[PDB]
Amino acid sequence: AHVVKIYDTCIGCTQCVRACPLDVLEMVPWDGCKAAQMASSPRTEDCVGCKRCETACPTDFLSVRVYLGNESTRSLGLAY
Amino acid sequence: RDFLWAQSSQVIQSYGSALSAYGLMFLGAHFVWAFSLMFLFSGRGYWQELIESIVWAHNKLRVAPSIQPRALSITQGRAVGVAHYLLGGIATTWSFFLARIIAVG
Amino acid sequence: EIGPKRGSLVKVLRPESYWYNQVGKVVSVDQSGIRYPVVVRFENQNYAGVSTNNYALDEIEEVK
Amino acid sequence: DIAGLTPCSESKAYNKLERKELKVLDKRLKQYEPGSAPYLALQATKERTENRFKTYAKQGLLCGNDGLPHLISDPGLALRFNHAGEVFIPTFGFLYVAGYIGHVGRQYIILSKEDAKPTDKEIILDVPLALKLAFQGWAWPLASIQELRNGSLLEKDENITVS
Amino acid sequence: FPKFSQGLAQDPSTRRIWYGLATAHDFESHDGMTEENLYQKIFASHFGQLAIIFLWTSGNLFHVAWQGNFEQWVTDPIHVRPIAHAIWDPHFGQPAVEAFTRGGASGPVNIATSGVYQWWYTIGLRSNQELYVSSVFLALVSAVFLFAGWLHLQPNFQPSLSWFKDAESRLNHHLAGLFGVSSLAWTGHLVHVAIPESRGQHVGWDNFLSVLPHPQGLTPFWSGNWAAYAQNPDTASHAFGTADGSGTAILTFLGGFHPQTQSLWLSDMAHHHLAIAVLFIVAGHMYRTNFGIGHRLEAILEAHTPPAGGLGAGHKGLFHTVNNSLHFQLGLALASVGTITSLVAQHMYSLPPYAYLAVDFTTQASLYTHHQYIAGFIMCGAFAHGAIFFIRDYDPEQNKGNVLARVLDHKEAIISHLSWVSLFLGFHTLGLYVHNDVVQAFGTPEKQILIEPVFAQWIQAAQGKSLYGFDLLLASSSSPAYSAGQSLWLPGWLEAINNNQNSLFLTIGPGDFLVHHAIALGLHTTTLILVKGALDARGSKLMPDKKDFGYSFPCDGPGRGGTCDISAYDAFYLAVFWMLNTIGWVTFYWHWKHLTLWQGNVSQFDESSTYLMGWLRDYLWLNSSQLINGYNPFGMNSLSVWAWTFLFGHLVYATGFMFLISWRGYWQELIETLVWAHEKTPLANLVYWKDKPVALSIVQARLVGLAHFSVGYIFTYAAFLIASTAGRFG
Amino acid sequence: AIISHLNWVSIFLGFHSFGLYIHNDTMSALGRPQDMFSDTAIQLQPVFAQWIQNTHFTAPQLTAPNALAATSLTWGGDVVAVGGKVAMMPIALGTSDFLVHHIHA
Amino acid sequence: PWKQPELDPDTPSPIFGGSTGGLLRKAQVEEFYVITWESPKEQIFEMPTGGAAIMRKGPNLLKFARKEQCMALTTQLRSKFRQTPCFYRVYADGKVQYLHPKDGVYPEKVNAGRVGVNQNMRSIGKNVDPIKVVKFTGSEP
Ligand code: CLA
Ligand code: CLA
Ligand code: CLA
Ligand code: CLA
Ligand code: CLA
Ligand code: CLA
Ligand SMILES: CC1=C(/C=C/C(C)=C/C=C/C(C)=C/C=C/C=C(C)/C=C/C=C(C)/C=C/C2=C(C)CCCC2(C)C)C(C)(C)CCC1
Ligand SMILES: CC1=C(C/C=C(\C)CCC[C@H](C)CCC[C@H](C)CCCC(C)C)C(=O)c2ccccc2C1=O
Ligand SMILES: CC1=C(C/C=C(\C)CCC[C@H](C)CCC[C@H](C)CCCC(C)C)C(=O)c2ccccc2C1=O
Ligand code: SF4
């Protein structure tokens, strides 16, 4: 039940998508960049809060932010 | 009572004798122990921000390092802690013992 | 030409940036209507280790 | 005198402390022979101890009821009652040395940054340049006020801020 | 279970239970909140804390009257020990009840340390009946407040938001009535009751109307001859209970202490709270409220703007900032109350206000440490609750160009110039102690760097102390300041300050010098940690938007080199370690300097406090002898309870090191292993938890470990402070 | 299974070993020294080590006939004095040595 | 993809003796995950929970209790052996859900069908202060 918002400064590196283990992020076409790509966060219900996505964004300041919030079974990474 | 308070009389009363070095190491070992607690209890985040406000003054006077100052890594702060921790904990016995036993009883 | 010249130094004005009120070389500029075309390169690294970032026209100004 | 402190010459506890510290060595000196090296070592320590006590008394120091010398910090009382060498004068002896270190390091930083690869110059120093600046810093207060009155000491809002 | 928050209730783990308690009284973040419902819920809750206070006081009175020796103490206050509450522990043995029954009472008891006996005896309480009658009074007042918190929450009797945001009426009613009239009445009590009870006369509800306080009555008050009430003061040879050596005065300005009871004159304290009532009533008629006259608060702040522009717009825009921000108002109150709490500590030990308190050495100590440790905790909250203002209740566009934005603009200068002072005091203070530790060790105690604190001795000479010989104005008979107040306060004041057997302006040496500077290291660096967490609360270069996350969050991740302990909560977290260290130095210095005074050997502190082995040898190691032998293998004394507590704090302190050093990831992998065993076991698997077990969160552990830390820091010193002072009785 | 079964042992030991020390402290402070764990008390003696001391002490007679004496005097025997100081003498194990040897585990 | 592949719950599993990192009571009650892939030969690979196992030529199937345990295996197979796995989510009610290649193309490659979600059209920072939203939730949305 975490929140993931991507901002206007994305450049279509795809490094955020490759890093997330839980497949929260995917690439969508867009007209704002040279690469003509942008990220997205359709399924944040599966988000866990590892912040590997933030680690990979090479911008001056991040085009991706994970705002932590209410927890859940999927978010807490509980096998039980 | 009978081990620590009692056998520490030879170390504490070592000032003015040949065992004076053990009395100082007994204290300095406590400093280095407590000094480790800054690294174990704290975190890199507070320190990297503090350095920024310090870099401002070093920048204001045009005296700043080209090698940017960065706080220690997380694993390093943990290593630095246990090192200064064990050194202070072990060196205290090294002073508490040799001063106690050289001055026999 | 839309923006600053190649190889020209410029000063940044993003408040968020690690390089704010600091100077860097213009690596390139795109003239295809992108929101953040101006590519800039600095000598000093940021906290992550990156020394480049795409800035905008309004966010950059002449040196010093 | 001042602050209810006696001079160290007139104090009794001061001389009591001298007779004590010498008695320890005399007892320690009885064990060894006259012409041995341990005897020569202790006699020298005896000679130094006798010299430490008389020199502190000769210097107009102030000893308290415990018998140990006390220092005075206000330059007014120090100059009025002739106790300036204690604190007031060493204050200027340090600041001359401390500013020496700043004026030197500040110049090495500025000059290496005017060239290519200044990062290498920090880990691998230019020793000929460092010695040159280190022997040119005898008159750092002149250069500071020269640089302040000129305005090339401080930077002007070309520094990074955070908000 | 949390009804105020649905987000936590959906949580299946144990994090729901823990976070439900900690976010309980944080009304702002609750679900479905409104600014109007917020003030009402606070107003009702603040009635509650009053209800516990008046009940807590009622419990002490009852448990003292029923089980104590108040009637026996007044007859011989010096020798008899007070009694707080009795003991019933069935796990005792026969040697313990024989040891703990030291009091005159039959069964075992606990000796008191608060000092309420000295306080109640001074204001005119001399019986156990009068305490029973009082315990009922506060329990009634306590129930009345509980009824009000419920009443003033109902649909009617529900104050509107405009009523809360009426500052001009609150000041006038609270300054005049709560402060002034209360201080006026307390003078009415000291005059009509207490001073007679000192001079033998028994005044109570039966006879307070018939008995006059003064022989003349009120006719001097109307005629204007107000000096008639200061004519025949109490003589020096005056017993505090009997009329031997008594007088007729009710208001006097004698100054100094009473000879027998080393305490302030009652006639002075009566005269004191009168003048305080006059200024505070006058100040209450200042602001404007429903009449034409009066000042306005907003008009004043807008006016005090300097013309040149050193402060920019100045204090403009601040009224709506303070009046709308509750965290701002709370920061100023705590910072004011936390400072006052230190004054109560500093000004009581020097000026004993109660009878036979200077003689009770154990009682003076606890009262000093209790208030100072509270003064640190409160003051650390002012900055913390001041940091929350910058996140939640700060509007930059409204507060543009004013003093509050101009401070936040150049914060890099404040945090930097602070770091210089902490480093400066830290290197040079430690370097001298270490310079003296060594040079003592090589047998040369004369080479120490002992600097005399001339500036403080200059004050004591300017305040009557003729020891140092500076011959300042008020130590000189020719000066006017000696001439003025010569008939009033100086004969009683000069006698006390020059007496070297009281705690009023103690003698100062080079040992006292190093500690007052080491104390400065604490305040300046503790402020640095808290100031930084406030100004950098909104953003840092490492985290440009902290404001979006909140006051308390664990971190932003391992990226950007690491972001552990950045939040403003983590700054408050680290300051408490310095708060405790600072108050420890302040308190260690009070105890030892007073023990040497009480033992008579003042030379112990002056010679040994210059090097740090003296603190470890002469203060800690030495005074921990009677305590540590509380339960010996041969037998047990009455100090066994303190030695047990003395270890109890040495243990709780160590348990916090777990939560501080060892962090979550080691434990959650461990709990996953116990979960596997609970399911694979044949019979235990039939039982299944309702809420899933998980390790404690990151922020929770910093809180928990700090509690286990601070409680051992306190329980350890309380045992040492009371046991060391009680066993020696001096 | 390893970490789970090993977790139970540490909890079993820290309770039954260190909890015994707290029991003795609490009993002493309450004035009940008869209920402590000690020699004059509810003795927990290390019977196994005591049996091994005697076996190695009475070995020269039977199990090592050609041995003129035992390996050390810690097992049993008489004192060996040198310069007015004892070099080694038999060490006796009691209730305290039981608790400490179990605290180490 | 062209069409979602429905689950074949009866396919051969790898040769694995067993371990303690398997499924717990949560799986039967709440949900569990299963992963499928097709190998050309018999190989050895590291399991996320436990040790090594031997794949089988043809389809293979595993059952896991977490999505990370499944995606951890995809990253191993896509890199080491260069395969194309696909995994689902199974509830206790028997319902099945096809998760990771939801469009048939992996997320790190664009596709025209996708639609953006949680896309703010502003720069990081440059957003309202918390005071403006003091009494409801959210400064970032
Ligand atoms: C002789 C002419 C004169 C002088 C000397 C002053 C002086 C002053 N006026 Mg003023 N005034 C004057 C004429 C004058 N006025 C006239 C003709 C008018 C028209 C009526 C006014 C109207 C006026 C108004 C309306 C106000 C003032 C105020 C002030 C005060 C602060 C102004 C300022 O810039 O802050 C100085 C600027 C700073 C930026 C402060 C620096 C802070 C330092 C650096 C911090 C150091 C802290 C650190 C912890 C130190 C170590 C301490 C440690 C030892 C404990 C100052 C005392 C203001 C006032 O009353 O506030 C007190 C105000 O509101 N003036
Ligand atoms: C005894 C333990 C101890 C000591 C010595 C310190 C010391 C310090 N802390 Mg600290 N801290 C501690 C425990 C300790 N802390 C604990 C338990 C916590 C809780 C987590 C904190 C939390 C904390 C915070 C949150 C902050 C500090 C800050 C500071 C600095 C204050 C400035 C000052 O006075 O420096 C000068 C004082 C000294 C004692 C200097 C130490 C160096 C001496 C001179 C020895 C020199 C080395 C010598 C030449 C030998 C070296 C050889 C060797 C390399 C082989 C200082 C470095 C503040 C800071 O850094 O701001 C500037 C700050 O913000 N600390
Ligand atoms: C010569 C270089 C140099 C200069 C001119 C300055 C200047 C300054 N520093 Mg800084 N500093 C330096 C190096 C330098 N720094 C280094 C290397 C460190 C890391 C240890 C720091 C860490 C530091 C802190 C943590 C703080 C300052 C602060 C300050 C300011 C107040 C002075 C002070 O507190 O001194 C303090 C000095 C020290 C704690 C130790 C300095 C180390 C040595 C003695 C000097 C370096 C000499 C250099 C290696 C020689 C190169 C010569 C070349 C020819 C080869 C001032 C602007 C304070 C501030 O924030 O400003 C208000 C402050 O709190 N400094
Ligand atoms: C007039 C006094 C006053 C008032 C009205 C408030 C009001 C508030 N504070 Mg504040 N605060 C104060 C003083 C005050 N504070 C002081 C003095 C400090 C400094 C210590 C703080 C530090 C502080 C922080 C750091 C935070 C608050 C927070 C809050 C908010 C409520 C949080 C909540 O429900 O926690 C309920 C919490 C609990 C029920 C847990 C408390 C458990 C304690 C720590 C255990 C104590 C030890 C144990 C019982 C000892 C037993 C002994 C044993 C041997 C038997 C609320 C606005 C929080 C906030 O606003 O969040 C944004 C927040 O983060 N306050
Ligand atoms: C004369 C009229 C009057 C009076 C007496 C009060 C009284 C009070 N109001 Mg109040 N109020 C009034 C009019 C009045 N109000 C009006 C007109 C409004 C509307 C504008 C309000 C609106 C209002 C609000 C909104 C709130 C209050 C609150 C309070 C209480 C403050 C908490 C407290 O107990 O502090 C007690 C303080 C003192 C007794 C004196 C000051 C203490 C300092 C530290 C001096 C210490 C002196 C001395 C050293 C102490 C020695 C002690 C001795 C035993 C050793 C207090 C009972 C609060 C409340 O409801 O709490 C339940 C609150 O939140 N008031
Ligand atoms: C004195 C401080 C202290 C104490 C008591 C403990 C205690 C413990 N640590 Mg530990 N730890 C500490 C400091 C401490 N730690 C520090 C500073 C660090 C950092 C290096 C660690 C790091 C650490 C690690 C890494 C591990 C532990 C583990 C353990 C547990 C071992 C199991 C065991 O024997 O418990 C049995 C119980 C006790 C020892 C408690 C002793 C006191 C008595 C018996 C309790 C009496 C209860 C009483 C009767 C009931 C009162 C109820 C009341 C409400 C009425 C135990 C809970 C291990 C663990 O949890 O896994 C097994 C583990 O892996 N600790
Ligand atoms: C951060 C913050 C905050 C906080 C703050 C604080 C907490 C503060 C501190 C501060 C403080 C806490 C202060 C203090 C003060 C004090 C003082 C300043 C005083 C002084 C005094 C004086 C002035 C006196 C004088 C005198 C007299 C009268 C007589 C005798 C002599 C003498 C000289 C002593 C707030 C909330 C606002 C908010 C925002 C942010
Ligand atoms: C203090 C601290 C820092 C800051 C520490 C730093 C930057 C290390 C400072 C190293 C100094 C520069 C070494 C030199 C010290 C003296 C100057 C040596 C004496 C030399 C004189 C004799 C000349 C961290 O970065 C940190 C990170 C993670 C967890 C905890 C901590 C932590 O506790
Ligand atoms: C031991 C430990 C745990 C695990 C500890 C656990 C699960 C113990 C908490 C549960 C026990 C059962 C509560 C024990 C009862 C307390 C003694 C009393 C609590 C009283 C409250 C109800 C008020 C963590 O989760 C952790 C997290 C982050 C850093 C360090 C640590 C850490 O050290
Ligand atoms: S990591 Fe950030 S910059 Fe890179 S493609 Fe993803 S959103 Fe864009």
mmCIF file of N, CA, C and O in Angstrom, chain F residues 70-104:
data_model
loop_
_atom_site.group_PDB
_atom_site.id
_atom_site.type_symbol
_atom_site.label_atom_id
_atom_site.label_comp_id
_atom_site.label_asym_id
_atom_site.label_seq_id
_atom_site.Cartn_x
_atom_site.Cartn_y
_atom_site.Cartn_z
ATOM 1 N N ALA F 70 51.516 -37.349 38.758
ATOM 2 C CA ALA F 70 50.456 -36.943 37.854
ATOM 3 C C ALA F 70 50.930 -35.825 36.932
ATOM 4 O O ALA F 70 52.020 -35.271 37.086
ATOM 5 N N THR F 71 50.077 -35.492 35.963
ATOM 6 C CA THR F 71 50.434 -34.482 34.975
ATOM 7 C C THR F 71 50.537 -33.104 35.608
ATOM 8 O O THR F 71 51.445 -32.331 35.286
ATOM 9 N N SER F 72 49.609 -32.776 36.499
ATOM 10 C CA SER F 72 49.618 -31.502 37.194
ATOM 11 C C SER F 72 49.041 -31.693 38.586
ATOM 12 O O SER F 72 48.396 -32.699 38.887
ATOM 13 N N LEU F 73 49.286 -30.705 39.434
ATOM 14 C CA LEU F 73 48.787 -30.700 40.799
ATOM 15 C C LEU F 73 47.380 -30.134 40.907
ATOM 16 O O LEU F 73 46.793 -30.174 41.992
ATOM 17 N N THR F 74 46.833 -29.603 39.814
ATOM 18 C CA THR F 74 45.461 -29.119 39.831
ATOM 19 C C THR F 74 44.482 -30.251 40.108
ATOM 20 O O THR F 74 43.421 -30.033 40.703
ATOM 21 N N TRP F 75 44.822 -31.467 39.685
ATOM 22 C CA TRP F 75 43.944 -32.604 39.932
ATOM 23 C C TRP F 75 43.881 -32.925 41.415
ATOM 24 O O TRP F 75 42.799 -33.151 41.968
ATOM 25 N N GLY F 76 45.026 -32.944 42.071
ATOM 26 C CA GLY F 76 45.112 -33.306 43.467
ATOM 27 C C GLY F 76 46.538 -33.576 43.866
ATOM 28 O O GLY F 76 47.377 -33.982 43.060
ATOM 29 N N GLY F 77 46.812 -33.344 45.145
ATOM 30 C CA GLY F 77 48.133 -33.563 45.694
ATOM 31 C C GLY F 77 48.470 -32.582 46.792
ATOM 32 O O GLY F 77 47.622 -32.259 47.628
ATOM 33 N N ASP F 78 49.711 -32.100 46.789
ATOM 34 C CA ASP F 78 50.213 -31.184 47.798
ATOM 35 C C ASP F 78 50.740 -29.923 47.131
ATOM 36 O O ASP F 78 50.869 -29.853 45.906
ATOM 37 N N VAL F 79 51.044 -28.925 47.959
ATOM 38 C CA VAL F 79 51.455 -27.628 47.445
ATOM 39 C C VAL F 79 52.915 -27.678 47.030
ATOM 40 O O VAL F 79 53.719 -28.435 47.590
ATOM 41 N N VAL F 80 53.260 -26.871 46.030
ATOM 42 C CA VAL F 80 54.635 -26.684 45.584
ATOM 43 C C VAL F 80 54.977 -25.217 45.782
ATOM 44 O O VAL F 80 54.467 -24.349 45.065
ATOM 45 N N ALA F 81 55.848 -24.949 46.747
ATOM 46 C CA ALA F 81 56.217 -23.599 47.139
ATOM 47 C C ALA F 81 57.583 -23.266 46.567
ATOM 48 O O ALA F 81 58.479 -24.117 46.553
ATOM 49 N N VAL F 82 57.736 -22.035 46.092
ATOM 50 C CA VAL F 82 58.982 -21.554 45.511
ATOM 51 C C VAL F 82 59.151 -20.096 45.908
ATOM 52 O O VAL F 82 58.319 -19.254 45.552
ATOM 53 N N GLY F 83 60.225 -19.798 46.631
ATOM 54 C CA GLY F 83 60.468 -18.436 47.049
ATOM 55 C C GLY F 83 59.440 -17.890 48.005
ATOM 56 O O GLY F 83 59.186 -16.684 48.005
ATOM 57 N N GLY F 84 58.837 -18.744 48.823
ATOM 58 C CA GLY F 84 57.767 -18.328 49.701
ATOM 59 C C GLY F 84 56.431 -18.133 49.029
ATOM 60 O O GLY F 84 55.476 -17.725 49.699
ATOM 61 N N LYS F 85 56.334 -18.408 47.730
ATOM 62 C CA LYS F 85 55.096 -18.304 46.979
ATOM 63 C C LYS F 85 54.761 -19.664 46.392
ATOM 64 O O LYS F 85 55.646 -20.448 46.044
ATOM 65 N N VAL F 86 53.466 -19.935 46.282
ATOM 66 C CA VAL F 86 52.987 -21.212 45.773
ATOM 67 C C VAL F 86 52.957 -21.134 44.252
ATOM 68 O O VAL F 86 52.482 -20.153 43.675
ATOM 69 N N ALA F 87 53.495 -22.164 43.602
ATOM 70 C CA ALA F 87 53.458 -22.237 42.149
ATOM 71 C C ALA F 87 52.125 -22.792 41.672
ATOM 72 O O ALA F 87 51.490 -22.231 40.773
ATOM 73 N N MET F 88 51.687 -23.894 42.268
ATOM 74 C CA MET F 88 50.410 -24.490 41.921
ATOM 75 C C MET F 88 49.975 -25.392 43.062
ATOM 76 O O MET F 88 50.810 -26.009 43.728
ATOM 77 N N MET F 89 48.667 -25.455 43.280
ATOM 78 C CA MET F 89 48.077 -26.251 44.339
ATOM 79 C C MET F 89 46.718 -26.713 43.846
ATOM 80 O O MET F 89 46.171 -26.112 42.915
ATOM 81 N N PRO F 90 46.156 -27.782 44.421
ATOM 82 C CA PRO F 90 44.890 -28.310 43.901
ATOM 83 C C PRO F 90 43.744 -27.317 43.927
ATOM 84 O O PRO F 90 43.510 -26.633 44.928
ATOM 85 N N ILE F 91 43.029 -27.243 42.813
ATOM 86 C CA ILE F 91 41.878 -26.366 42.669
ATOM 87 C C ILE F 91 40.622 -27.164 42.981
ATOM 88 O O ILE F 91 40.385 -28.223 42.389
ATOM 89 N N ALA F 92 39.815 -26.648 43.901
ATOM 90 C CA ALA F 92 38.560 -27.270 44.286
ATOM 91 C C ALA F 92 37.410 -26.622 43.532
ATOM 92 O O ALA F 92 37.371 -25.399 43.371
ATOM 93 N N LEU F 93 36.481 -27.452 43.074
ATOM 94 C CA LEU F 93 35.308 -27.011 42.333
ATOM 95 C C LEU F 93 34.093 -27.113 43.241
ATOM 96 O O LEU F 93 33.932 -28.110 43.953
ATOM 97 N N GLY F 94 33.250 -26.085 43.215
ATOM 98 C CA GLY F 94 32.066 -26.036 44.047
ATOM 99 C C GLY F 94 30.850 -25.487 43.336
ATOM 100 O O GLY F 94 30.745 -25.560 42.109
ATOM 101 N N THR F 95 29.917 -24.933 44.111
ATOM 102 C CA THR F 95 28.672 -24.429 43.542
ATOM 103 C C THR F 95 28.924 -23.250 42.618
ATOM 104 O O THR F 95 28.248 -23.097 41.596
ATOM 105 N N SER F 96 29.878 -22.392 42.969
ATOM 106 C CA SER F 96 30.151 -21.229 42.139
ATOM 107 C C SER F 96 30.766 -21.639 40.812
ATOM 108 O O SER F 96 30.430 -21.083 39.761
ATOM 109 N N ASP F 97 31.667 -22.618 40.839
ATOM 110 C CA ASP F 97 32.305 -23.072 39.611
ATOM 111 C C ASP F 97 31.309 -23.760 38.686
ATOM 112 O O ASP F 97 31.515 -23.813 37.469
ATOM 113 N N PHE F 98 30.223 -24.296 39.246
ATOM 114 C CA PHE F 98 29.146 -24.845 38.430
ATOM 115 C C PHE F 98 28.466 -23.748 37.628
ATOM 116 O O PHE F 98 28.248 -23.892 36.420
ATOM 117 N N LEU F 99 28.118 -22.645 38.288
ATOM 118 C CA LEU F 99 27.388 -21.577 37.621
ATOM 119 C C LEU F 99 28.234 -20.932 36.538
ATOM 120 O O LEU F 99 27.739 -20.640 35.444
ATOM 121 N N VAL F 100 29.517 -20.720 36.818
ATOM 122 C CA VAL F 100 30.376 -20.010 35.881
ATOM 123 C C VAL F 100 30.643 -20.860 34.646
ATOM 124 O O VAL F 100 30.543 -20.374 33.514
ATOM 125 N N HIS F 101 30.984 -22.137 34.835
ATOM 126 C CA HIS F 101 31.202 -23.019 33.690
ATOM 127 C C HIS F 101 29.954 -23.149 32.823
ATOM 128 O O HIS F 101 30.063 -23.394 31.617
ATOM 129 N N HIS F 102 28.762 -22.983 33.407
ATOM 130 C CA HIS F 102 27.540 -23.016 32.603
ATOM 131 C C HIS F 102 27.223 -21.654 32.005
ATOM 132 O O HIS F 102 26.508 -21.574 31.003
ATOM 133 N N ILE F 103 27.728 -20.576 32.605
ATOM 134 C CA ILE F 103 27.560 -19.254 32.009
ATOM 135 C C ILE F 103 28.392 -19.142 30.740
ATOM 136 O O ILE F 103 28.028 -18.423 29.803
ATOM 137 N N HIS F 104 29.524 -19.840 30.692
ATOM 138 C CA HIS F 104 30.378 -19.775 29.514
ATOM 139 C C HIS F 104 29.716 -20.447 28.323
ATOM 140 O O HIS F 104 29.823 -19.969 27.189
#
